[PDB]
Structures are given as C-alpha cells and as structure tokens.
Write a protein that binds this ligand. Sequence first.
Ligand SMILES: [C-]#[N+]C1CCCCC1
Ligand SMILES: [Fe+3]
Ligand SMILES: [Mg+2]
Ligand SMILES: [Mg+2]
Ligand SMILES: [Mg+2]
Ligand SMILES: [Mg+2]
Ligand SMILES: [Mg+2]
Ligand SMILES: [Mg+2]
Lengths: 212, 192
Amino acid sequence: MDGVHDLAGVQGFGKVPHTVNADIGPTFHAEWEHLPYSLMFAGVAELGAFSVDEVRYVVERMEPRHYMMTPYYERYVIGVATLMVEKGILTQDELESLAGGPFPLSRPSESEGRPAPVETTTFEVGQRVRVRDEYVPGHIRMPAYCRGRVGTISHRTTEKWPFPDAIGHGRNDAGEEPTYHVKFAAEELFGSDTDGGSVVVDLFEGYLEPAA
Amino acid sequence: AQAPVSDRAWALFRALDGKGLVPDGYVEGWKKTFEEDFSPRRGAELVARAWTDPEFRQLLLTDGTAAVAQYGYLGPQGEYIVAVEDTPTLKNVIVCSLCSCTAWPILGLPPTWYKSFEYRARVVREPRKVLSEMGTEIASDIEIRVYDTTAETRYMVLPQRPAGTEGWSQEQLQEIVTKDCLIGVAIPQVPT
Ligand SMILES: [C-]#[N+]C1CCCCC1
Ligand SMILES: [Fe+3]
Ligand SMILES: [Mg+2]
Ligand SMILES: [Mg+2]
Ligand SMILES: [Mg+2]
Ligand SMILES: [Mg+2]
Ligand SMILES: [Mg+2]
Ligand SMILES: [Mg+2]
C-alpha cells in the first residue's frame, strides 16, 4: 500500500529529536501506553483474532492526515480497536460509550490482499536480484524506495514466515517463504541525492526475481 | 474530533476485559516484561561477551539466534536475530522505516526518536547527516550501511571495541555499550 507510512526517502523533515545517549525517560510516559501492545498480544496470542501483520496493515489504513498527527502508541490503540470492531468482537458504539466521546477508527481496507506467489526462486548469497516492479494496494513489506531496484543477496533466512500480503489481510493462503537481506548501493536507490553507502532491505522471496 | 487518548485506551481495555477476553494480570504482566525484562543491558552483555570471547563472537555473527538463545534472551520481536559487525571501514545502523520494528528483548522497546517520522524518513537516505546531527561523526572513508527492518529479522549492531578498554572485565565493557550503540547511531565511548 503506497500510504503515507512509507516514509523512507521522504524529504523535508527536520532534526531527529535526539542526541546520542540522551535520557529517553521511562519506557512508558503515560499510564495507558502499555495497553496497545498488551492488547495486540491478547488479540494475536490469546484470542487468535488477528495476526501481527494485520496490526501493521490496520495502522497503514489510518486516514492519511489522521496517521500524520497521531503519536506512535495512539496509532496502535486506534489500530487494535479497529481490528476488534472489524472482527466483530467489539462495536464502535461501546468503545465510544466507554471513552465518553469520539473514537474514529482506521479506514476500511480497499484490497482483499493477495496469496503467496506460487512461482518464486530460491536465491543464494552473492546473487544479484531485482525487486519485482509491482504495485500492491493492500499490505506489503516492500518500501517503495526499493521497487524495481537491483541489489545483491547477503543472507537467506534459515526460517520461513507467512507472506505479509496475505496474512496482513487474515487470508488462508499466506504459505511460508524465507526472506533475503538484499544489499543496495545508496546510489541505486537515490541516485546522487544520498550521503550513504548501502542499504539492506529484508525482503520476502515473493518480492524478488533474478536480475538482468 | 477525538476523546482524550487515555480515555480511548482504557475504553479499549474495559470493552475487552468486560467480555472476559483479557486474562487476569495480563496487561500488568506485559507491562512488567516491557519495563523490566526487555532491556539494552542484555544486548550490552552480548557485545561484551563477543568482544572478549572470539568463539562467541563467531557464533553471534553466524547464528545470532543461537548465540542470543544461549543467554536466554530470545523473545517477542526477537526470535530470529542477526548481529551486524562494524569494522574500521563499515558502520551499521538500524531502522524500521515502515513502523518501529526493533529487537525488543535485547535492545528494549524502541525510543520515541527511533519511531519518529524524522528518523524513519531520513536515516535511509542521509544516514551520515542524521548521525552527525545526533552527535556521531562518521568519516568519509567509512561505508555507512543502513538495515531497514522490513520483515522478521531483528538486528543488533556489534560495534567496534574502543582503544583504552584493553583488559577490561565484561562488566566494565557492558557499561559502555548503550542502547544507541546497539541501534547503531552511537559509537561506544571510553569514560574519562
Ligand atoms: C514495528 N512495529 C510494531 C507493530 C508490529 C509488531 C512490533 C511493534
Ligand atoms: Fe516496525
Ligand atoms: Mg493528539
Ligand atoms: Mg458515529
Ligand atoms: Mg479482572
Ligand atoms: Mg510465531
Ligand atoms: Mg539530503
Ligand atoms: Mg581489570
């Protein structure tokens, strides 16, 4: 999904609000902040109502202006609440009644997702690969800066996981794939307009194809 | 228009808890895990061991998961671990440009700055400038490599060991390996 969450490479932001080893304060700065992650885990591990991938996607589905003005932990309060409503576990009415006011949610999905590709290649360390030049309206773990770009495999995972584009929509056809650490030259991604060396993206097999 | 966030967060809790969907002590248990167990002190311990034990260093760099498992530090958002090695010509830095993905058990939960739009947008494209602004100068003869945490690999940086620490104990070395060293935005410093 080409949403505003796909921030890598966006220009115009100011300074990172940190200098190294500065005090970051306590883990939680407010008494509610542990709730989004804890209730995520209740949904995922206790209820089996959704996957972690569905949590990423529901956050991506926040209305774009809403996403941009909402602090991190609040996005996950909204996301988890949205999933609970979408899955039929809670109603928005009861959330708003308990909250004592408006509790707007993420926008409905505009894609049913897609299955794990049937045709993929097992790649090896040192091989050159291209990120498939594809556009996916639902959840995808490919940041746009690497779409259609060429890099070299530095690692093939020794474990496999469900394809996000499927499990992020709660589909039954996510299968399992390894991922690949794909190293791109900075100039491959941003031309002359970068001060970096290389960028390594951890990409599912289904996002990749042989280069050349 | 929105109700206060605290009211919304507790509404979510109460709506689920009131239906019997949240085990007793559940969110309290997670809070404790997040605050007390998940810690960059764990990553620091791993680094100090790697620095003093060539055999462990090799294990950590070839099978991060196995190395971390030896200490018992695998956990949520830290089940498949890759450690990335800084060298005299290479500096590694970690981000999750798409959200906040972080090796929780060994680095701790991500700090506000790491999850900021500023860091997520900028470090992938201008890491040298970002690190410089944050207080870390990386020379032109050093390649900066940014790892974007886009799938299930969870990363830690194994930073270079600074001169002046020769013969230090693991406890002494652990003290200079900070959260920011593990993320890759800081280089370990020898205290005056
Ligand atoms: C990134 N991130 C958040 C959502 C997915 C699980 C880890 C925390
Ligand atoms: Fe993330
Ligand atoms: Mg606000
Ligand atoms: Mg209404
Ligand atoms: Mg109770
Ligand atoms: Mg699992
Ligand atoms: Mg620039
Ligand atoms: Mg001594």
